[PDB]
Amino acid sequence: EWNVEKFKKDFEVNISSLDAREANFDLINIDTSIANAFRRIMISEVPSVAAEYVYFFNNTSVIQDEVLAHRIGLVPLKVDPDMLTWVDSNLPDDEKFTDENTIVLSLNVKCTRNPDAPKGSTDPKELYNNAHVYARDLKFEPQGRQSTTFADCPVVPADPDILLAKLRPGQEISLKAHCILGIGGDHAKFSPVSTASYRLLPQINILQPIKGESARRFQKCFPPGVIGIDEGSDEAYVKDARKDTVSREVLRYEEFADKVKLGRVRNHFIFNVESAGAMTPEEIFFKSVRILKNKAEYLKNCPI
Amino acid sequence: PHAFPSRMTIGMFVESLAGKAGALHGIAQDSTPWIFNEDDTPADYFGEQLAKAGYNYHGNEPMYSGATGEELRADIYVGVVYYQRLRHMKFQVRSTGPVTMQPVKGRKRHGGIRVGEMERDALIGHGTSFLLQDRLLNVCRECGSTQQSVPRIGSISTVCCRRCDSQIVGGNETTTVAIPFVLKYLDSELSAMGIRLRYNVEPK
């Protein structure tokens, strides 16, 4: 008789390397179904913000307008998703956008050579000002209540050092973007996570007593932080399972083929969540689980 | 993977292996024919690099499914290879439009598709008579080989076939029949050709 209380008693978490950019927490005593559901929800369903509906006023750069628009769209912003509202998408364009459902960006860069240039110089910065166009050149000219709301939240790229385009003297670019909330599945541009995969905790089942220098070469096959040597009896043993990538290098050697079976536990998920600068991995994980809860509740409440 | 046993391109596998090794170590891998003797097998050469890098010696990287989320039965052979896009990027459809009264030829001209002789044979081979009729489709009563439809003042259109008021002198034996419109062109061409046949017009 499996039950919620039994699951709660058996389930436990082990946060390993929590960071403002990356998370490496573990899930224990949970089913691959729920683990993969979380993985997929994090990768796709978790909402985020990215630029689209870009309007061009003028462009003459070598990079084409479509390429530039796509390149700008593939930028990580900083505003939290829980500050904006979805768009009905079946409205007139003037009504399609408001203060609280989108944000506006402007680039309007112009490039011209600076006469003061050292002789025999090939560096574009010295040869011409505005030689390169960076993300930080994007401004976030607000509208209406956005000025008050974003006072402590200036909309800046999560990575202002990215290279949108290169210019030349007499070369100018001027555009106008419109970032909205994304759903990830619509386009990878709306991906709050660089990658939210997981790996099952490797399991090493030592059968024979591995001793002597033969144990030392067995130690060599795995990554250094995995196998331990028992000083008491010169015995090889597992020190840290998480430290091992599934390499199967031992299987190549015939001596150890029968001495160990490289199994894998089935209820120990080593989650590893990178992120863009929009939100922290913990925040996006909580968003994912709450999204799953909302899905279940909506499915329950909608009648048949 | 089923492509390889017939195609027999071990080069794809070796490229995948060396590409993974190069992408990991950062170095560039050279692929020049006749530099690997059998005693210097490229599989071994790149496996040594992958092992020193800490990956699978044979390139078999363990993977997990994306739908079930469970581990796959065997480690997947994954690597990096060079991939080129070709220019062979075609679809055509028509219902009516341009048209021997048969539809025009050409994708860009909103044309149709010709039902060839072998297609007609396939139509017959199945015995699908109505299907053949719909894929290949969809008269002077006395002479049986036109001329009609010239109302004068306020009367309905009648027939005045010269080959044949009421019948002036022409004839008044002609009714509508269902035929392909290539037939009229064939009739006119034979009339110029000076050849006529007893086209046995069936009765009512």
Binding site: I270, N272 | F36, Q49, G54
Partner: peptide, 14 residues
Amino acid sequence: RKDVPKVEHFATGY
């Protein structure tokens, strides 16, 4: 013939 000369990865969270 001289053979091709030789050339002189962490888990997640490590």
